[PDB]
Design a protein around this nucleic acid. Structure first.
Ligand SMILES: [Zn+2]
Ligand SMILES: [Zn+2]
Ligand SMILES: [Zn+2]
Ligand SMILES: [Zn+2]
Lengths: 1287, 676
RNA sequence: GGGGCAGAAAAUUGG
RNA sequence: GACUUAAUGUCACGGUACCCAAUUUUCUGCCCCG
């Protein structure tokens, strides 16, 4: 007749629901689904505070189920007193149904009591149920109950005010995923509550019969689950900070807006978020990157004046003002506030409305009328029941992702919303699931869904889960899954996640689509989680053993546990390690199970427990079947995914840009390489150094683009309800992908010294000939060489069910990657990321090996231009010329509007590669500006810069950007194209003096010039790719005797061009492009070497290494989708003939760097026609291409009076080709005996290097008494006109 | 103005969708493109949007909600989502007043048709009183142009269904030609209480349905009108149910050997109302006996027409692969005809006779009527040439069957006492199969079961008495899934015996050491291509393997042989050399059909595919037994091919249920599934 | 008599 | 002990926030008169 004070403690996050009595429960769907949860009621008014509890009927149901199971174990007895089966049906004629109905099976046994239970005496089971009581179904006084359960209230440890809902609960969206398609069908919400602070409930049970006390106290220790969480039942005896940060972020945004730099604010936001990965010292020790030396402006954006001070000191003051919220919350809140103010000032709040994608569905918990059933289950008398417990750890072999909805939607009170209303999105598009202490989490539902998926695969058959149900499903999967209990996992790691960006490409123009950037949070690889599984039954299943052996890893085999939600990109493959299996017998060790409470909540101790410290009743399980004996394995689970592993060799620099890490790291660089954060398990830190990698998204997109171009499916405007090959292999909106890709990791990064290389680039104006304003940049890629290649190891998984044609498509894509059609990374058109070779591991399947293995002259132009005979062929060595001249075409440009696409390999067009060689006729200077000190000599004399030759890992090279710029200037001058790179500035501006047709092509509406059609623009990728040139043969290192290095030259002072000389006298116009003259003016610089190291300051001039004449370099030009005349004009621009050459490098006014390009081989391939290796393309058809290009130029000129035929073209009939070929004519090549004298004037006699009586100063050449302005401009437009006697 | 250009572009797209010349895929692309441009215009002009743009949004959502096909035996939530969004959108349209009169009446008519469709598809959300108030306000505005739009006619017919009297509007309702005959009969019945024109126009409607496919709306509304007429106790439903049954039969006649029919929800209630109509007309007093026998024969014909096909789902129709290239063409014309009928409704051997049995046979049909909750057994006797019928209830039998199913699927051999309880419950619930008047003593009985009674052992029923006698001790039983599977011309005529075997865990090595299997076709380690090489009509084929049951498609239930096994469709296609061949299958039925959770089930095993091929009979097991029992059956059939199965079941200990229930479990598991 | 430029322009989410 | 349960009947451990997208396109480390 004594009370019992009971406490229940939760060891897992449990579930909460709002309280409605009995009819308002039927009004709501969440309340009908939310029974058997914990209940929340509001206290007071305003919907802010309340209290939570657990009803006594739920505890009564759990105790009744435990009593029935314990009586079923001992064959209807407990400690010697037999029990009857009891009653579980109610006739509707007398009395009402008891407000809850049972759909599950009821365990029964043979009743051998030989008595019928009456009111006067009854068994413990009947008196525990409450059959023969005075109270039933209508409440009265709290006496006349034989056994009574009170409500269970939350034991708040410290007394405070009324507890809030947002301090205890948090909302979350769960899912249901179809098995055949791999896509969700519907969703539903729930409230999850904390167990660390708010997981203890206290109640009272009153029993007025000392005959069923032992069964009740035993059954209290057999309850294992309640409210969606593991439990143990025992018997006892900052709005102001957000407002301040919004005000200061408004200050920063206005300070940026005054400088007309609003669009950087977005970028700045991301940078501040990246500062959560570092410590606080990056704002306290000032480790943010400083700018270039001797620059008045500092960094790109860390040195913008905000109300008089720099941005870094403003951030220091802001961190001193807000030190009480931590570093992480400060960075995240500042980033979010800056993003919100940017979105407000721009004008678009990003509405986020979705047409027909919600489908929120709750299971109809009400019973439709009919189907009130009673199903007894009778176990055989002999049978044994056991419980198996499996303990281990989960390890992430790849970066993982567990998706969650955005904050300001996971608020438990304010879930009220409407269909019409739009939803404001936040800074991060895809968030990750975390704990309250910012720990990483594997939820129970994802583990249970993955186990259900692998069990359905292992059985080979199963049911799709039905929600509105009156009869329990008897499929095998469901029978086994009704006996499995899991537990949620949290790591011991509380560091911030990593942001990974993703774009999407437009296949027609090969550039980025509009509105396709997004960012995903990923977790580190190598993290470890606990793993607990329990199974209660009569025998251990073979399919469960097959799934456990599938998930674990060993030597040779690797784990195959796919959890999470980015599986096609390879995110979420786990492995199972440290597996121990223990067995508990229940027919003889039931008291020990009751006493130890099943080790619920003490499974961490079991992993480190020895053999001799186990409790009583728990034995190690020895009959665990090995992997080669499991028949559901190796028939259903092993052939499911197959692995292809390969290695790519890249013999060029490789750059996959980051652009935010370059902002937040020291060095002051524009684009740096991509790095990963890998976690270590032996030492609990992350790692000291990162690992360079190529993303899985990138080479997934490479494979997809290759397959789509070979088949022809990229050209379709929509892929909704599509059965094409690309949508079958790579998935769509309605189907998941049949192929899964992983990252490419660098495997040979320790064989290098100085892994990263510094390469700087510039843009050269077409008129002035110098560098353009704000057009200088740097890149920091990985240093790959033709003799020191980078090796990247990658992997992709393929599914069972593939046909032969799709395997042929994948093999053809791999062969296209091996041949070099798809370069990795960025800046591929200037030679970055060019694939040199492939290799395939020997454990790749045999059919793939056979498919990849089975898929494996002195050309001259002989044309001679008649050079300008009045300068040098009349007077040999008595004239002085000007080092640069101007080439003037007309005004008209042919603009084309049917632009050639990149989405297929068209039938009539051409694609292939050219192998070319380059020979130096004059000395060549290509500096290496990574090291300003270079050789030596900075310590002896301050100031002076000295460089070496350009090299990667000790191999002399010429970059592809220089060759591309030289060939682009030649092609645009040949084809009368627009001025591609131009600047508008001080003496009106010189943009207005240009004709409107020669302005650069902006947009695709008006069309594209031939240069912008071949070489590309901002919104159209080009169709030519230039590679890095390698040194092959010949001499080296031009030797001057008296010099501090032997292979060196100290050059003269060289400064910026002045357009005031070229266009004076306001009624004048820009005279076209600027070209330089071929001469041996380097001998004057060489012999006058002592007079240069004195008589001028060392700060002005530069010292460099030089190469002699006769060197040979080799390089490659690749092309796709070229017409015959475009290829003809390209082959003519490469090799314009005998005695015509190009200009490359430093010191072009002094005569350095005359190069001759000779074509060695041309190869064209046609993959629309069936197959063969690449052809040879002999001399006749390439001469036909040159003739087609000449006829196209004749048609563009308009003078159609010249006939057509198979005659060798004389190019000098057209005027501008004649002017161009006179500008690029070499007068010392055919063993002629003439050399010109080309040098600049002297500027105001008695100055440096004035010859005695030449009268060649700028005083007597710019004073209008001789040579007026029109004669001066005409003297710069005619090539090779003499200046010292002035024609 | 550019906004009017965008609006007229959207209306041009919607009127392109309205024309009955476009395909469903083109309709989907056009209407979702129009919805994309309208939602972009909404995002641009969010609060400065005019009312008519919101009206166009709701109209586009109605056209989207038309073209969503129902997958599964329930309403998809995409349709309800589209309907509720179009209701919300038109609500904020009609709260945005001061349009013209045409805009106001157009908004009210769009809201009316949206509320009508949402009330039809969902009842608890949209009650009838809200529909009454909404349509009363809509006709208070004056949407009564019955010569222009059919939507006003739908409003009128729905209001006459609800009860708002519209005898003032009756002449305009009848004189309109756009209203078809069903609305005319509904108007004549619901308002004027004139029955003769209603009977005429209902006869025209049931005559019109004989070429219309099953996926049309008129079937659904006709059966709903018949059920409403039945609910108020009229006198015209008894003819209309039989007329609609005859129309559905003559329409479903137009299919082939791939027995499929479209799944619509009100098929079963139509067949139940037709059965109840013919049953009541047979219960009415008639002095001529031949009319009564003809009406009982019509009951049997109704049951046969229900049992003939098996009503595949929609996602199973889209999901299943393509083979043999002509059955693909018949399947594709069936599928595209059905879907174009579904959208076109909304945009604007020879079969034997029932008395052609051999002499000395009694035939028993079953029909579970879900409306009255009863079960009817129809008996045909050939020697007396008579028809009779009796009734029973099927609730407690379903409870005992589910108890046996749960106990079996947990403890396979130890559910023998629940098997005995189920057999005694069959004998108690259906006592007429022990009476001499219903079934004569000593005649072979053929059962044609239709429900979960396919799974019940009928031969092992126990008489409700003290010393109970089994059913199989005096009668020889045979089974059949439907009467349309029965055929003539056995003509075995050959003496070749073939074996196939894939599983080696069963101890059949003593059986493979036999000398009867002396032909080249006998082999261990069988495959599907080795199954399709059987040459010319073996007398006895024995397949020993396992089974896998697809729980949605009966076409994908497979026999576990090598190289992926052989499926139902491949048995229908590839196997040709099995005419007049007795087949003994070693795999149990429980591995070939999924376990059931409803009272109704229609899932056909591979044995009926063997019957459709041409086999003479299939002898199999209902549940899992030991391998030695199948070995003894195969040996007894090899030594003796003429003898019946009930003598073997009696001899081996099939009458020992009171003392040793494992022998009774192993004995009565064997069933012959083929009619001579 | 004397050094400049040291990044610029888009895309920041949609099915 | 009110807020806050009904007692001969609760599978919610009956449901993976899932599917689809290449951080990319263009650019000579160059160079003279007040
Ligand atoms: Zn009792
Ligand atoms: Zn199931
Ligand atoms: Zn496609
Ligand atoms: Zn251009």
């Amino acid at each position: 007749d004594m009370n019992i004070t009971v406490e229940l403690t939760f060891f897992e996050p449990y579930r909460l629901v709002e309280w409605f009595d009995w009819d308002a429960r039927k009004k709501s769907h969440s309340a009908m689904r939310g029974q058997a949860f914990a209940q929340w009621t509001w206290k007071g008014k305003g919907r802010t505070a309340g209290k939570s509890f657990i009803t006594g009927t739920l505890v009564r149901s759990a105790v009744i189920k435990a009593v029935e199971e314990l009586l079923s174990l001992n064959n209807g007895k407990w400690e010697g007193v037999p029990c009857c089966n009891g009653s579980f049906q109610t006739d509707e004629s007398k009395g009402k149904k008891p407000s809850f109905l049972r759909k599950r099976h009821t365990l029964q046994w043979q009743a051998n009591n030989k008595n019928i239970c009456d009111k006067e005496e009854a068994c413990p089971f009947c008196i525990l149920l409450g059959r023969f009581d005075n109270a039933g179904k209508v409440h009265e006084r709290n006496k006349d109950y034989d056994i009574h359960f009170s409500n269970f209230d939350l034991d708040h440890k410290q007394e405070k005010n009324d507890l809030r809902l947002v301090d205890i609960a948090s909302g979350r969206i769960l899912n249901r995923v179809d098995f055949d398609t791999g896509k969700a069908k519907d969703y539903f919400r729930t409230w999850e509550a904390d167990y660390e602070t708010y997981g203890t409930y206290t109640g009272r049970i009153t029993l007025r019969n000392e005959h069923a006390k032992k069964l009740l106290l035993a059954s209290l220790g057999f309850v294992d689950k309640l409210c969606g969480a593991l439990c143990r039942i025992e018997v006892i005896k900052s709005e102001d900070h957000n407002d301040e940060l919004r005000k200061q972020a408004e200050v920063i945004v206005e300070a940026f807006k005054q400088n007309d730099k609003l669009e950087k604010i977005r970028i700045l936001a991301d940078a501040i978020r990246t500062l959560r990965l570092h410590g606080e010292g990056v704002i306290e020790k000032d480790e943010l990157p400083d700018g270039k030396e001797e620059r008045d402006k500092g960094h790109h954006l860390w040195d913008i004046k905000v109300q008089g001070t720099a941005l870094r000191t403003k951030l220091k003051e802001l961190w001193q003002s807000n030190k009480d919220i931590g570093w992480r919350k400060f960075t995240e809140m500042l980033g979010s506030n800056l993003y919100l103010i940017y979105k407000k000032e721009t004008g678009g709040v990003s509405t986020r409305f979705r047409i027909l994608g919600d489908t929120e569905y709750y299971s109809k918990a009400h019973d439709s009328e009919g189907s009130d059933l009673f199903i007894p289950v009778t176990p055989p008398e002999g049978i044994e029941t056991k419980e198996w417990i499996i303990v281990g750890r989960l390890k992430a072999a790849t970066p993982f992702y567990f998706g969650v909805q955005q904050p300001s939607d996971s608020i438990p009170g304010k879930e009220k919303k409407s269909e019409d209303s739009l939803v404001i999105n936040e800074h991060t598009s895809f968030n990750i699931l975390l704990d309250k202490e910012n720990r990483y989490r594997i939820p129970r539902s994802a583990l249970r869904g993955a186990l259900r998926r692998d069990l359905r695969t292992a059985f080979g058959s199963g049911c799709n889960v039905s929600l509105g149900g009156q009869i329990l499903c008897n499929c095998k999967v469901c029978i086994e899954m009704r006996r499995i209990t899991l537990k949620d996992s949290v790591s011991d790691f509380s560091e911030p996640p990593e942001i990974r960006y993703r774009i999407a490409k437009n296949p027609g123009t090969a550039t980025v689509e509009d509105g396709s950037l997004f960012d995903i949070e990923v977790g580190p690889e190598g993290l470890t989680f606990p793993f607990v599984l329990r199974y209660r039954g009569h025998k251990f299943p073979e399919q469960l053993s097959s799934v456990i052996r599938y998930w674990e890893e060993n030597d040779g085999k690797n784990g195959m546990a796919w959890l999470g939600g980015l599986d096609s990109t390879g995110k979420g493959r786990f492995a199972l390690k440290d597996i121990k299996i223990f067995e508990w017998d229940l027919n003889q060790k039931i008291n020990e199970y009751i006493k130890e409470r099943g080790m619920r909540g003490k499974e961490k101790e079991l992993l480190e427990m020895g053999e001799s410290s186990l409790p009583d009743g728990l034995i190690p399980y020895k009959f665990f079947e090995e992997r080669e004996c499991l028949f559901p394995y190796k028939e259903n689970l092993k052939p499911q995914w197959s692995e292809v592993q390969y290695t790519i060799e890249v013999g060029s620099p490789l750059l996959t840009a980051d652009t935010i890490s370059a902002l937040t790291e020291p060095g002051n660089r524009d684009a740096i390489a991509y790095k990963k954060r890998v976690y270590n398990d032996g030492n609990n830190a992350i790692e000291p150094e990162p690992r360079f990698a190529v993303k899985s998204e990138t080479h997934r997109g490479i494979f997809r683009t290759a397959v789509g171009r070979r088949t022809g499916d990229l050209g379709k405007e929509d892929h909704e309800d599509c059965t094409c090959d690309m949508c079958i292999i790579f998935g769509n909106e309605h189907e998941s992908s049949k192929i899964r890709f992983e990252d490419l990791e660098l495997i040979n990064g320790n064989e290098f010294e100085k892994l990263e290389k510094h390469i700087d680039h510039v843009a050269i104006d077409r008129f002035t000939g110098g560098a353009l304003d704000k057009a200088k940049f740097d890149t920091y890629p990985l240093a790959g060489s033709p003799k020191k290649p980078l090796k990247l190891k990658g992997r992709f998984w393929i599914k069972k069910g593939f046909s032969g044609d799709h395997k042929l498509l994948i093999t053809t894509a791999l062969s296209d990657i091996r041949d070099g059609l798809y370069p990795l990374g960025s800046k591929g058109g200037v030679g970055y990321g060019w694939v040199a070779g492939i290799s395939i591991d020997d454990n790749v399947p045999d059919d793939f090996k056979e498919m990849i293995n089975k898929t494996e002259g002195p050309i001259n132009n002989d044309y001679v231009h008649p050079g300008h005979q009045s300068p040098k062929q009349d007077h040999k060595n008595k004239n002085i010329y000007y080092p640069h001249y101007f080439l003037d075409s007309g005004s008209k440009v042919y603009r084309e509007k049917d632009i050639i696409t990149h989405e297929e390999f068209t039938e009539e067009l051409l694609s292939g590669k050219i192998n070319c060689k380059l020979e130096t006729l004059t000395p060549l200077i290509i500096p290496d500006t990574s090291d300003e000190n270079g050789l030596k000599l900075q310590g002896n004399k301050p100031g002076h810069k000295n460089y070496k030759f350009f090299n990667i890992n000790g191999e002399l090279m010429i970059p592809g950007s220089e060759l591309r710029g030289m060939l682009r200037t030649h092609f645009e001058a040949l084809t009368k194209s627009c001025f591609a790179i131009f600047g508008e500035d001080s003496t009106k501006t010189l943009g207005g003096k240009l004709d409107k047709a020669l302005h650069p092509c902006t947009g695709l509406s008006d069309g594209l010039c031939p240069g912008c059609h071949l070489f590309g623009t901002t919104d159209y990728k080009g169709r030519v790719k230039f590679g890095f040139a390698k040194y092959e043969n010949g001499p080296e290192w031009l030797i001057t005797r008296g010099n501090n290095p032997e292979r060196s030259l100290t050059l003269g002072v060289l400064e910026s061009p002045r357009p005031a000389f070229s266009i004076p006298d306001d009624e004048s116009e820009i005279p076209g492009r600027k070209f330089y003259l071929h001469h041996n003016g380097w001998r004057i610089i060489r012999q006058k070497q002592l007079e240069i190291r004195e008589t001028v300051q060392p700060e002005r001039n530069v010292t460099t290494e030089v190469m002699d004449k006769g060197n040979v370099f080799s390089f490659d030009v690749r092309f796709e989708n070229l017409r015959e005349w475009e290829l003809g004009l390209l082959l003519q621009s490469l090799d314009p003939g005998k005695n015509i050459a190009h200009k490359l490098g430093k010191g072009k006014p002094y005569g350095f760097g005359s190069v001759k390009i000779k074509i060695d081989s041309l190869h064209t391939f046609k993959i629309n026609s069936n197959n063969d290796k690449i052809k040879r393309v002999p001399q006749s058809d390439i001469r036909e291409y040159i003739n087609k290009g000449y006829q196209k130029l004749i048609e563009w000129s308009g003078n159609n009076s010249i006939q057509k035929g198979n005659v060798l073209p004389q190019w000098h009939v057209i005027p501008h080709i004649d002017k161009l070929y006179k500008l690029l004519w070499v007068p010392f090549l055919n063993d002629s005996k003439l050399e010109p004298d080309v040098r600049y004037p002297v500027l105001n006699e008695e100055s440096k290097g004035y010859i005695e009586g030449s009268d060649y100063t700028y005083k007597k050449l710019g004073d209008k008494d001789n040579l007026p302005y029109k004669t001066r401009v005409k003297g710069l437009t005619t090539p090779w006109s003499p200046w010292n006697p002035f024609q | 103005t550019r906004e009017d250009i965008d609006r007229k572009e959207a209306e041009r797209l919607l009127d392109e969708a309205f024309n009955p010349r476009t395909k469903p895929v083109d309709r989907k692309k056009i209407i979702n493109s129009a919805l994309k441009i309208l939602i972009g215009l909404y995002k641009e002009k969010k609060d400065d949007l005019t009312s008519a743009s919101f009206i166009s949004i709701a109209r586009a959502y109605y056209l989207v909600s038309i073209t969503i096909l129902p997958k599964g035996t329930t309403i998809p939530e995409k349709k309800k989502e589209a309907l509720r969004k179009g209701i919300e959108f038109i609500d904020r349209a009609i709260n945005k007043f001061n349009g013209s009169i045409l805009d106001s009446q157009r908004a009210f008519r769009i809201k009316s048709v949206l509320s009508i469709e949402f009330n039809r598809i969902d009842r608890e959300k949209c009650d009838n009183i809200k529909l009454k108030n909404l349509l009363n306000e809509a006709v208070d505005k004056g949407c009564t142009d019955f010569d222009t739009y059919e939507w006003d006619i739908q409003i009128a017919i729905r209001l006459c269904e609800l009860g708002v009297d519209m005898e003032g509007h009756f002449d305009n309702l009848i004189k309109s030609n756009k209203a078809n005959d069903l609305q005319k009969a509904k108007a004549y019945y619901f308002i004027k209480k004139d029955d003769h024109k209603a009977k005429e126009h209902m006869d025209k409607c049931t005559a019109s349905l004989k070429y219309t496919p099953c996926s049309h709306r008129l079937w659904d509304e006709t059966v709903g009108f018949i059920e409403r007429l039945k609910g108020d106790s009229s006198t015209l439903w008894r003819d209309f149910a039989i007329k609609t049954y005859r129309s559905c039969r003559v329409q479903e006649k137009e299919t082939g050997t791939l027995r499929l029919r479209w799944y619509w929800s009100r098929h079963r209630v139509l067949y139940d109302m037709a059965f109840l109509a013919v049953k009541e007309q047979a219960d009415d007093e008639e002095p001529d006996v031949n009319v009564k026998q003809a009406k009982i024969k019509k009951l049997a014909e109704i049951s046969d027409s229900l049992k003939s096909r098996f009503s595949l789902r929609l996602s199973d129709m889209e999901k299943m692969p393509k083979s043999d290239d002509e059955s693909n063409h018949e399947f594709k014309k069936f599928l595209d005809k059905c879907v174009t009928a579904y959208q076109d409704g909304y945009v604007i051997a020879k079969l034997l006779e029932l008395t052609q049995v051999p002499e000395g046979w009694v035939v028993v049909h079953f029909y579970l009527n879900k409306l009255e909750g009863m079960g009817n057994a129809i008996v045909f006797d050939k020697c007396a040439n008579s028809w009779q019928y009796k009734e029973f209830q099927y609730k407690e039998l379903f409870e005992v069957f589910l108890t046996w199913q749960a106990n079996y699927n947990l403890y396979k051999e130890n559910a023998a006492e629940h098997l005995v309880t189920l057999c005694k419950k069959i004998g108690e619930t259906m006592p007429f199969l022990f009476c001499d008047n219903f079934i004569p003593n000593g005649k072979d009985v053929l059962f044609v079961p239709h429900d979960f009674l396919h799974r019940l052992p009928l031969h092992g029923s126990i008489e409700n008495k003290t010393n109970g006698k089994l059913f199989l001790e005096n009668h020889s039983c045979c089974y059949l899934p439907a009467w349309s599977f029965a055929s003539e011309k056995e003509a075995s005529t050959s003496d070749e015996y073939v074996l196939l075997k894939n599983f080696d865990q069963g101890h059949f090595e003593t059986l493979q050491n036999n000398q009867i299997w002396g032909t080249q076709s006998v082999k261990d380690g069988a495959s599907s291509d080795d199954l399709e090489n059987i040459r010319n009509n073996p007398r006895l084929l024995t397949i020993l393997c396992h089974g896998e049951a697809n729980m949605s498609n009966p076409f994908r239930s497979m026999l576990k042989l090598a190289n992926g096994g052989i499926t139902y469709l491949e048995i229908l296609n590839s196997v040709k050399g099995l005419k007049g061949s007795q087949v003994i299958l070693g795999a149990c039925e429980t591995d070939l059909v999924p376990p059931l959770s409803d009272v109704m089930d229609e899932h056909y095993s591979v044995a009926t595919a063997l019957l459709l091929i041409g086999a003479a009979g299939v002898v199999g097991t209902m549940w899992k037994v030991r391998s030695n029992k199948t070995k003894s059956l195969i040996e007894w059939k090899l030594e003796n091919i003429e003898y019946k199965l009930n003598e073997w079941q009696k001899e081996t200990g099939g009458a020992a249920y009171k003392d040793h229930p494992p022998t009774f479990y192993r004995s009565i598991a064997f069933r012959s599934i083929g009619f001579p």
